[PDB]
């Protein structure tokens, strides 16, 4: 009484149809006009009805008792509607309040702190450039206050209706709330606890970095600016969301006299262009016997920020068009070291799309959202090593010293370790909303006390419940689950650890092969494992995807630690030599107003 024939035909129709939706989403995010927005939401609306209409057809085929579970896996998968279980009126209203946040974020503009006439700097070039190169706390605060008021506050209404709808659509699909809805993606009833245990294990490591980073800032910026024992005024951390601090390694690194790998300047002097960066990114993959970027990629991709007065979404991303070889990336690439890692990250997504094209539509996605983010990140870890950067000439003369080693792990610490708690709070925050755990009157402080609790970070200026900051973060505004990044930073080190071993680069004993200096570039057995894994495409629960890569079947934090071990035992000692304060007392940055004028 097969249903295989039905699923085959179905996926082909879903694929054919999601292609049309993707083209509008893409046209829109490349040129933000009302027409494209309307069409975009229009495709999503037609599809939503087709889904409902297919949700009721499966009543026919009673899969909840079938034989082969590959087929029965597909049914549980497609029957699971998302925001489509939502009645027609709400759905269009969701597409809308959602559209309102997304466009609001992308259209933000502020005026130079030094020219109230310009008012045309965006978050991509200008503003993010300032928060990363400026060492004027007053100016940095300026850009923080201006961006948060526009990208966050301006959209509390949309955001509120979203949470209410997001929750409604959750219960219509039998989930307790959107919170458990996202977690279903990891297919493991104890995933939140697994993720709580690992954070608990690295937390001590996080504060040996935190307190230290707080020891230099207060030394650099001054007592009055950065206090001891108090949470670090974000905005001095070089990142608008302080999710990553590497941008301030020129005033925070362990050994300023020794080298600080910052290949940005060399790329620039060497006539580097986004295209070249993409080609380099493409070689790394082919070098591992992995799939090369198809011809549609170089034709249909946007690797440079448009030069017309257009408004677009330029938060780097990778698109699967659901055909054969139609993969493209949209990025406002700039020639800097961070962008080079981002390029690879994105390519990571592209490798994944290519690796699993042949899979039934329902499986043309990652094994749990985490794997999708990690792929490219494993490669970026290699192009970040003095080893590989020397091999491509982006690092002239460099001596591994010993303390030059401390300036590399620590860097990767202001990126890979610092993030873990940030990424956790993002969803931990949206979860507590999805789950009616927080009252509307406490929505903005629930966010900061949570940024305080886990990261020891606070706004540069006082904020109150009148403001609404969570939306200043792209993923909050664009409705993108975030737990994916946190698992990705955990499991990407497991992938990387094994990949380097499957290659002759890492041996727990051989001291001439430290796990923080293996390149895996041009490694066939490494790509081959990446093939057994990526080719599966959500065809099996994530434990098997992992197993196919290295035989292990459990998510763990043994990787990161084993990587940053030489660094960890450098802080507990250095932080005692400079007599550095660990931990912080609660914040006073959230309140409910106060004025000095009648």
Give the binding range for Zn ion (CB under 5 A) out of 91-99, 141-149, 372-380, 396-404.
372-380
**Backbone φ and ψ of 319, nearest 5°:** -115, 130
Closest CA to 217 of 201, 204, 234: 234
> Smaller CB distance to Zn ion: residue 373 or 415?
373
How many residues form the binding site for Zn ion (CB under 5 A)?
1
Annotated active-site residue 475? The verdict is: yes
Q: 496 by DSSP, 3-state: which?
A: helix
Q: Annotated binding residues for Zn(2+), as ranges?
A: 345, 349, 373
Phi, psi of 138 (to 5 degrees): -65, -45
CB distance 161 to 83 below 8 Å? no
Q: Which residue in 32, 48, 138 sits closest to 86, CA to CA?
A: 48
Interface residues for Zn ion in 22-61 (CB under 5 A)?
none
- Report d(CA 545, CA 210) in Å as an integer: 35
Residues annotated as binding site? 345, 349, 373
Angle CA(266)–CA(270)–CA(276) in degrees, nearest 5?
Answer: 105
Nearer to Zn ion, 78 or 316 (CB): 316
For Zn ion, the closer of residues 185 and 373 by Cβ is 373
Distance CA 260, CA 97 (A): 45
CA distances from 70 to 359, 362, 475 (A): 12, 11, 32
Among the residue ranges 119-127, 170-178, 180-188, 366-374, the one whose residues contact Zn ion (CB under 5 A): 366-374
Q: Which of 247, 282, 326, 373 binds Zn ion (CB under 5 A)?
A: 373
Q: CA 93: distance to chain centroid?
A: 27
CA 553 to chain centre: 23
CB of 496: closest distance to Zn ion in angstroms? 16
Q: How many Å apart are CA 520 and CA 503, to the nearest integer?
A: 6
Q: In this chain, which stretch among 28-36, 81-89, 370-378, 380-388 interacts with Zn ion, using CB under 5 A?
A: 370-378
- CA dihedral over 253, 257, 261, 264, signed as positive or negative: positive
Q: Which of 562, 571, 569 is nearest to 253 (CA)?
A: 571
* CA 396/CA 341 separation, integer angstroms: 19
Asked if 320 touches Zn ion (CB under 5 A), the answer is no
x/- contact string, 322-361, with Zn ion (CB under 5 A)?
Answer: ----------------------------------------
Which stretch of DSSP H or E encloses residue 591? strand 590-591
Out of 315, 344, 388, 475, which one is annotated catalytic? 475
Residue number with CB closer to Zn ion (372 or 502) = 372
Enter the tokens of residue 76.
């549980």
Taking residues 216 to 255 in sequence order and writing x for each that binds Zn ion by CB under 5 A, - otherwise, the string is ----------------------------------------
CB of 510 to Zn ion, least distance (A): 33
Shortest gap between Cβ of 406 and Zn ion (angstroms)? Answer: 30
Output the smallest distance, CB 349 to Zn ion, in A. Answer: 6
CA-based angle 423:424:426, to the nearest 5?
65
**Minimum CB distance to Zn ion, residue 490 (Å):** 15
Residue whose tokens read 């961070």: 338
Nearest to 490 by CA among 427, 554, 557, 549: 557
Residue (370 or 456) nearer to Zn ion, CB: 370
Candidates 126-134, 358-366, 371-379, 449-457: pick the segment binding Zn ion (CB under 5 A): 371-379
Instruction: Select which of 37, 185, 346, 458 is catalytic.
Output: 346
In the complex, minimum distance from the CB of residue 86 to Zn ion, in angstroms, rounded to a whole number: 26
Nearer to Zn ion, 41 or 301 (CB): 301
In this structure, how many other beta carbons lie within 10 angstroms of the beta carbon of residue 489? 24
Smallest gap, in angstroms, from Cβ of residue 206 to Zn ion?
23
The distance of closest approach from Cβ of residue 369 to Zn ion in the complex, given in angstroms and rounded to an integer, is 10
| 233 or 369: CB nearest Zn ion | 369
Find, among 108, 88, 82, 101, the residue nearest to 161 by Cα.
Answer: 101
Looking at 368-376, 404-412, 428-436, 537-545, which segment touches Zn ion (CB under 5 A)? 368-376
| Closer residue to Zn ion, CB minimum distance, 180 or 481 | 481
SS3 breakdown of the chain: % helix, strand, coil, rounded to 5?
A: 60, 5, 40
Q: How far is the CA of 481 from the CAs of 389, 395, 478, in angstroms?
A: 33, 37, 9
When the beta carbons of 376 and 471 are compared against Zn ion, the nearer one is: 376
Is 562 considered catalytic here? no
Rounded to whole angstroms, the Cα distance separating 505 from 212 reads: 31
Q: Quote the longest CA-to-CA distance of the chain.
A: 78
Query: In whole angstroms, what is the distance from residue 440 CA to residue 433 CA?
Result: 9
Q: What whole-number distance in Å separates Cα of residue 578 and Cα of residue 20?
A: 60
Report the residue number whose CB is nearest to Zn ion.
373
Catalytic residue numbers?
346, 475
Residues that bind Zn ion in the complex, under the rule CB under 5 A: 373
């Amino acid at each position: 009484i097969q249903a295989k024939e039905y699923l085959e035909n179905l996926n082909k129709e879903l694929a054919k149809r999601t292609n049309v939706e993707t083209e509008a989403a893409w046209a829109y995010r490349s040129a933000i006009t009302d027409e494209n927005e309307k069409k975009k939401n229009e495709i999503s609306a037609e599809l939503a009805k087709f889904m409902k209409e297919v949700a009721s057809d499966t009543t026919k085929f009673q899969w909840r008792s079938y034989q082969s579970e590959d087929l029965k896996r597909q049914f549980k998968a497609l029957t699971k509607l998302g925001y489509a279980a939502l009645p027609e009126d709400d759905y269009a209203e969701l597409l809308d309040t959602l559209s309102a946040m997304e466009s609001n974020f992308a259209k933000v503009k502020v005026c130079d702190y030094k020219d109230s006439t310009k008012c045309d700097l965006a978050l991509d070039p200008e503003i993010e450039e300032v928060i990363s190169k400026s060492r004027d706390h007053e100016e940095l605060a300026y850009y923080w206050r201006e961006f948060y008021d526009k990208a966050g506050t301006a959209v509390r209404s949309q955001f509120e209706r979203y949470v209410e709808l997001n929750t409604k659509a959750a219960k219509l699909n039998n989930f307790t709330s959107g919170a458990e809805a996202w977690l279903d993606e990891y297919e493991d009833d104890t995933f939140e606890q697994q993720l709580e245990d690992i954070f608990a294990d690295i937390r001590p490591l996080y504060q040996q970095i935190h307190g230290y980073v707080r020891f230099r800032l207060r030394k650099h910026y001054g007592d009055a600016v950065v206090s001891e024992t108090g949470p670090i005024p974000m905005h001095l951390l070089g990142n608008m969301w302080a999710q990553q601090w590497s941008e301030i390694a020129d005033i925070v690194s362990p050994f300023p006299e020794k080298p600080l790998v910052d290949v940005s300047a060399e790329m620039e002097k060497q006539a580097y262009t986004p295209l070249k960066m993409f080609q380099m990114g493409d070689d790394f993959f082919t070098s591992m016997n992995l799939t090369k970027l198809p011809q549609d990629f170089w034709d249909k991709s946007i690797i440079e920020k448009p030069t017309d007065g257009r408004d677009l979404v330029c938060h780097a991303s990778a698109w699967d068009f659901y055909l054969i070889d139609d993969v493209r990336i949209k990025q406002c690439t700039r020639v800097t070291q961070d962008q080079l890692f981002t390029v690879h990250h994105e390519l990571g997504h592209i490798q994944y799309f290519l690796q699993y094209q042949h899979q039934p539509f329902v499986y043309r996605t990652g094994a749990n959202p985490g794997f999708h983010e990690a792929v490219g990140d494993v490669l970026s870890l290699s192009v970040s090593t003095p080893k590989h950067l020397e091999k491509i000439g982006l690092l002239k003369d460099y001596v591994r010293d010993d303390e030059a080693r401390i300036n590399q792990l620590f860097l990767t610490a202001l990126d890979k370790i610092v993030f873990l708690p940030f990424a956790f709070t993002m969803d931990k925050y949206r979860w507590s909303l999805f789950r009616g755990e927080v009252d509307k009157a406490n929505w903005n402080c629930a966010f900061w006390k949570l940024r305080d609790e886990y990261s020891g970070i606070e706004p540069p200026v006082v904020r109150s419940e009148k403001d609404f900051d969570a939306p200043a973060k792209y993923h909050i505004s664009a409705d993108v689950e975030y737990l994916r990044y946190l698992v990705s930073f955990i499991i990407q080190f497991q992938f990387y650890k094994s990949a380097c071993i499957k290659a002759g680069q890492y041996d727990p004993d051989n001291v001439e092969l430290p796990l923080d200096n293996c390149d895996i570039y041009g490694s066939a057995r490494a790509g081959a494992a990446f093939h057994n894994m990526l080719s599966m495409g959500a065809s099996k629960p994530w434990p098997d995807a992992l197993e196919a890569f290295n035989g292990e079947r459990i998510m763990s934090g043994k990787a990161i630690a084993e990587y940053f071990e030489p660094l960890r035992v450098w802080l507990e000692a250095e932080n005692i030599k400079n007599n550095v304060h660990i931990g912080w007392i609660t914040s006073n940055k959230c309140v409910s107003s106060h004025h000095h004028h009648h």
